[PDB]
């Protein structure tokens, strides 16, 4: 019609902009100049809209898209309206089956680059040269919930990366914890069914806080290690950018000389590790179920590209049996204290998709999609995975041609004798559809293995034993890893774990299941067990109190790399601050606050009791981002309150409650001049308290003190103080 | 191994039990004796489990379900493991496409029966005899969210009823507001795209509080009427039990003489009308996303069967053109003050399904599934709905044999000449698959229309007009119904409509969209318009302040049946109270509480700061349902604090906050003896305040106050008092 505003305000700028500054938009409109090979190769399917006639799928233009065709303007709809029928028909068939697991996820385009050639240890083309850039598509996710469940639930997160190499797609389909729950793939449906919503009533969505999960866990002690990790703050990450990623399984690197090295893949978050606290995460699933998704998208639109360092734990073939645990057991981790992570490369995510359904929804990642230079191992969990991803995608994606769906296509050439199938796009001209053939001179042809561009040959591992359905006795050890994890945690981390098991176990209706988990915890650590028992009104028996603790892991009593916070890796860029306005802000405070934040790449959100504008003491007009209720403290990392007419919000329940929720969830809080009248709301001494920045104005050290607090993430020392506080 | 507790406490008692008294279960195990003809007919596919051997789907017994088959215990998985491949295959193919709209839904079985024969106005066999029961299957849903989205979001609610009649399936597919947002089916996809997650980033889930929704609404004022209902407390019902249901369109009733009568369908909730408040509801999507689901399932397990009265608005054919709105326009309601709802029958939902997926997820409802005695009209929304339910179902349910899926099958005879199709169950023995045929003597045969048991014949409506794509000029009025709704609401209802609009519009990033919506509100009612503008920081212009209000609706200045609360309809049975224990409960207080609660059918949930048990003063051991934080005030209708050792909880942060939250959400609170010391936490009154029950002990009087309050649902008079509270 010509419905946009004449000021062109309906359209976000094609330049990096801070979160909330502009309406968010499709990747290619938001950042047209951010390219990569894969992004360029999708131009054949991108479709514009501006200046084009509205049409049917057959290209016939539509005159009236507001009405069905009827016999009289008040008459019956006619079957002949083919415009209405194609339109409703496409609408009626929009949905596809969501992923069996990892239905909820958020994705983005990016690129990867190795620091140096790894040719000595792997002939994988994407790792052979530091100037070799490989496009990537990454999808982060939760395990249990459907596609419409919440982001900040407690859960293990999925971390899958599609590498569009020159010698094939390589998918690294990992999680954000270094182990999995089960050992053998045959039990996946059992474990997954136990964690998913119970079969009679489909409750609860996106949560393990229910009977079947803990029932399973309590009868399968192999699960404890990963359960420890999910029960910790690892299970509620601050963002997909602030968690670690792992392949979990031991795989093989094969070099040109044919030598196999055992490898465990890792991703290190260059923004560091940071997690929410439980009450915040649970509230955030309600106030904004799309928090991670939104944050990922906005970090990319703001230029805060999520960056990760690919790392490798490398173990020589000769050291296979040198640990107390089996290298092929997925419920066991390789302590970095024993086997360090070697820095391999950097992955940068710098552009959102155009259409979520087309790119994110249909992305198909598979762990068996490896390339020459990599190989598998006999890890029994991995072994079954190679069966499952290929299988599930014939029904999710409607057929065997899911590789022709734009996001999934190789950027490298692909030729073979495979034909037909639903949705076939490629029109093969080869006179032959079989080999060996003479009619096309046998093309395309097999290709011998070699140092570069050769065919895929599996490493000749010796295989020996009888056909058996048997767990390896080396896998029958379930408690030392959980114990190692436990002892590597800070005290406040240990308390949060205790609190996760406690909350969780309290949602289990059948008491005996709770007791059974407590007994299992007593096999790991008595202090953990007791603390959780106590929260559940359970007493340990004299026998539980004497269970002998599991042995150290290869002599290790703790590995600080297992903690989120024991070793400071804080990084403020991309974090966000809430600024609580009033109707006459000391503009001097605001300029100081704002400039200091921007200097460190920390965003702000101007908040108030209504939308619109307020005018500072000097006449500066301040645009309001959202209300105290509309953009709660759960969505920010810190809260700053500038002086002015504090009496304007001093008695505002929402303004006060904002501070209480923020204080409760250990976020740094800064009160300027009269804003200190809010000290009484959170019971802050006259003298002060670590974690609360206060001054007569937002000058001098005020923002630096506040920014040092943001660097340590949360004010852990405040925990005991929050114990009470009614919020 | 891994067996049941010795004490049989793993399995629920098969009798009515209050919410949380026992683990919930499949309905046929929870209520084996609850039967109806449809329930019974599902018996061919019910599958037990106890005492049976674990097998593949081919019936082969499985010996070891813990392991894959491998060449040695540390070896690779073999391809010949068929047990493992069927098991994982089934698992990989579990998911089917969710419903395009209404993916989130909760269902149950029950029965329907007319109060009296309606044979004078319809020949429909299910309404012809008061002692003729019709088995039903009902599903309640939200519109926008995915199948894993949250229940208590702001949304219209779907209310679909599947009637298994002796003359065919009749599905009455309605919503909880008497109108829909749009006029013509052609605009369905446009509207549902505008409300669903935005296409580039697939945000936000289950919410209309985003730019596309308000943009669409601002450009199409026909939506305003249903938008009014959505922003009022009708958009957040307290349960599926406490909402109304409506078929929206005008359909027809055809009697045996052939007289057509215009009919609008209604359901009256016999538990009364009641809704949450926004903050409660939004917070509840985080604390318990499956709250309506759970509540329905528990009410049914408890014997608090959801009951609805089917009612009819009847308009003689000669009154078609007598209102000042077109009867065929679905953005218009028929005010009860003009055409009264006639009581027709009662529907009781008395049993949950066995398997959610099989029964709820595959259920297929269609507004075109009518039977003889009913018929359509030219409503242009309805007309397009006839095309779509049928079409979507072929992909959603994988083929044209969706009527053979157990929950969807008719209980009456079905015989025709349609053959084949994917997953065909029915093995047809008829020699003929066409008619007319001589080889089977033309069976099955056509049956003439007639008063009872006759074939379907459409009412012979006269059709006169040109083939046009045109909106009837009479559907061109968009403001007087919205105003009628506005003016018929209580003051606190009006405020909640204002706040809903203010909250939602504050989440619209592009400010001109806010503005255009406010301008549309100014066409409806200037008081309303200014209340929203004020909250958005917007100033109406002179022009806007001079928009003439729309006319009354046939002289109606207000209609009290449009409001949830003007006419009191309180019913406390099936509600639930939180009882905050301390560690030395005064058993006499508790005794009295429970007794009074029991006499009115109100359930209790005993809460404490830890799980397990507390012992009252007389040695009674009180098992704890959940902790203060574990089951927040959001989940209960009122709070009772008995005396005893109040010092145990007086300083508990979660206990104080429990009360503050409940207070803020206008729920009745009862404090006894030393519990009255919590009056300071909810910082108000000392002589007391309407809505806070208090006494030296919980007596008969004390409980009568509380039950009276609960019978009014919320403490509306406390509204002015909650916005200073920091909660
Ligand atoms: C170390 C253990 C595992 C890890 C780290 C893992 C990781 C993941 C991730 C990250 C995704 C989501 C991919 C996306 O974003 O599209 C996924 C999906 C999936 N996983 Fe795994 N998984 C593991 C074990 C298994 C096992 C044992 C099986 C079954 C044998 C399995 C079957 C599946 C299937 C069927 C999907 C859906 C994939 C699709 O539809 O494309 N996973 N897994
Ligand atoms: C007054 C207007 C409408 C009402 C009251 C309404 C109501 C409903 C309800 C309650 C459901 C959920 C059924 C269930 O629980 O399985 C549903 C589903 C659906 N609706 Fe409507 N709807 C309306 C308008 C429309 C229109 C105009 C269309 C398309 C022209 C449409 C297309 C659909 C589809 C495709 C489904 C999914 C059914 C399935 O997958 O089985 N609806 N509708």
From Swiss-Prot, chains A, B:
Its cofactor is heme. Induction: By entry into stationary phase. Keywords: Cytoplasm, Heme, Hydrogen peroxide, Iron, Metal-binding, Oxidoreductase, Peroxidase. It catalyses: 2 H2O2 = O2 + 2 H2O. GO terms for molecular function: catalase activity; heme binding; identical protein binding; iron ion binding. One of its GO terms (biological process) is response to oxidative stress. Homotetramer. There is a cross-link at residues 366-389 (3'-histidyl-3-tyrosine (His-Tyr)). Heme binds at residue 389. Its main location: cytoplasm. The lineage of its organism: Bacteria, Pseudomonadati, Pseudomonadota, Gammaproteobacteria, Enterobacterales. Belongs to the catalase family. HPII subfamily. It is found in: Cytoplasm. Its EC number is 1.11.1.6. The active site is at 102, 175. This is Catalase HPII. One of its GO terms (cellular component) is cytosol. Decomposes hydrogen peroxide into water and oxygen; serves to protect cells from the toxic effects of hydrogen peroxide. Gene3D superfamilies: 1.20.1370.20, 3.40.50.880, Catalase core domain (2.40.180.10). Residues 433-467 are annotated as: Disordered. Pfam families: Catalase, Catalase-rel, Catalase_C. CDD domains: catalase_clade_2, GATase1_catalase.
């Amino acid at each position: 019609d010509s419905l946009a505003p004449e000021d062109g305000s309906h359209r976000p700028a094609a330049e990096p902009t801070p979160p909330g500054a502009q309406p968010t938009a499709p990747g290619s409109l938001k950042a047209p100049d951010t390219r990569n090979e894969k992004l360029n190769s999708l131009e054949d399917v991108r479709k514009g809209s501006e200046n084009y006639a509205l049409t049917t799928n057959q290209g016939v233009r539509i005159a009236d898209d507001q009405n069905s065709l009827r016999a009289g303007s008040r008459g019956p709809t006619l079957l002949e309206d083919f415009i209405l029928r194609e339109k409703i028909t496409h609408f009626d068939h929009e949905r596809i089956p969501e992923r069996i697991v990892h239905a909820r996820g958020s994705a983005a385009h990016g690129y990867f680059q190795p620091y140096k050639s790894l040719s000595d240890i792997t002939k994988a083309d994407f790792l052979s040269d530091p100037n070799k850039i490989t496009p990537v598509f990454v999808r982060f996710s939760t395990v249990q919930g459907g596609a419409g469940s919440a982001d900040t639930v407690r859960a293990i997160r999925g971390f899958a990366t599609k590498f569009y190499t020159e010698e094939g797609i390589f998918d690294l389909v990992g999680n954000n914890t270094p182990i999995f729950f089960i050992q053998d793939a045959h039990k996946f449906p059992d474990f997954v069914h136990a964690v998913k919503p119970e079969p009679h009533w489909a409750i609860p969505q996106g949560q393990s806080a229910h009977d079947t999960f803990w029932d399973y866990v309590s009868l399968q002690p192999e699960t404890l290690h990963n359960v420890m990790w999910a029960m910790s703050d690892r299970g509620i990450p601050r963002s997909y950018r602030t968690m670690e990623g792992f392949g979990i399984h031991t795989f093989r690197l094969i070099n040109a000389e044919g030598k196999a090295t055992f490898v465990r893949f890792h991703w290190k978050p260059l923004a560091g590790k940071a997690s929410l606290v439980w009450d915040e995460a649970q509230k955030l699933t309600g106030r904004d179920p799309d928090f991670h998704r939104r944050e990922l998208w906005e970090a990319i639109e703001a230029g805060d590209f999520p960056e990760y360092e690919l790392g490798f734990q490398l173990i020589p073939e000769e050291d296979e049996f040198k640990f107390d645990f089996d290298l092929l057991d997925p419920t066991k981790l390789i302590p970095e204290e024993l086997v360090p992570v070697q820095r391999v490369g950097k992955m940068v995510l710098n552009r959102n998709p155009d259409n979520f359904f087309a790119e994110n929804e249909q992305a198909a990642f598979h762990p068996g999609h490896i390339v020459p230079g990599l190989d598998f191992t006999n890890d029994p969990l991995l072994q079954g995975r190679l069966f499952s991803y290929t299988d599930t995608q014939i029904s999710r994606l409607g057929g065997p041609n899911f590789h022709e769906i734009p996001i999934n296509r190789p950027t490298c050439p692909y030729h073979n004798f495979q034909r037909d199938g639903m949705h076939r796009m490629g029109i093969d001209t080869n006179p032959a559809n079989y080999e060996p053939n003479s009619i096309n001179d046998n093309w395309p042809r097999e290709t011998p293995p070699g140092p570069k561009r050769g065919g895929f040959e599996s490493y000749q591992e010796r295989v020996e034993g009888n056909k058996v359905r048997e767990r390896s006795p080396s896998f029958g050890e379930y408690y030392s890893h959980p114990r190692l994890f436990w002892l590597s945690q800070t005290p406040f981390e240990q308390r949060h774990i205790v609190d996760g098991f406690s909350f969780e176990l309290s949602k289990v209706v059948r008491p005996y299941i709770r007791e059974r988990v407590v007994d299992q915890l007593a096999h790991i650590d008595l202090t953990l067990a007791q603390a959780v028992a106590k929260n559940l009104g359970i007493e340990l028996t004299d026998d539980q109190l004497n269970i002998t603790p599991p042995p150290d892991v290869n002599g290790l009593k703790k590995d600080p790399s297992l903690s989120l916070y024991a070793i400071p890796d804080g990084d403020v860029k991309g974090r966000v601050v809430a600024i609580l306005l009033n109707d006459e802000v000391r503009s001097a405070d605001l300029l100081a606050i704002l400039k200091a934040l921007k200097a460190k790449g920390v965003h702000a959100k101007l908040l108030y009791s209504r939308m619109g504008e307020v005018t500072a003491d000097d006449g500066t007009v301040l645009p309001i981002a959202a209300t105290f209720a509309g953009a709660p403290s759960l969505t920010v990392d810190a809260v700053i309150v500038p002086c002015g007419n504090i009496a304007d919000i001093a008695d505002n329940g929402d303004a006060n409650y904002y501070l209480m929720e923020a204080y409760k969830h250990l976020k740094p809080i800064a009160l300027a001049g009269d804003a200190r009248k809010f000290k009484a709301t959170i019971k802050i001494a006259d003298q002060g308290e670590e974690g609360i920045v206060e001054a007569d104005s937002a000058d001098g050290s005020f923002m630096d003190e506040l920014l040092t607090l943001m660097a340590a993430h949360r004010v852990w020392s405040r925990i005991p103080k929050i114990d009470k506080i009614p919020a």
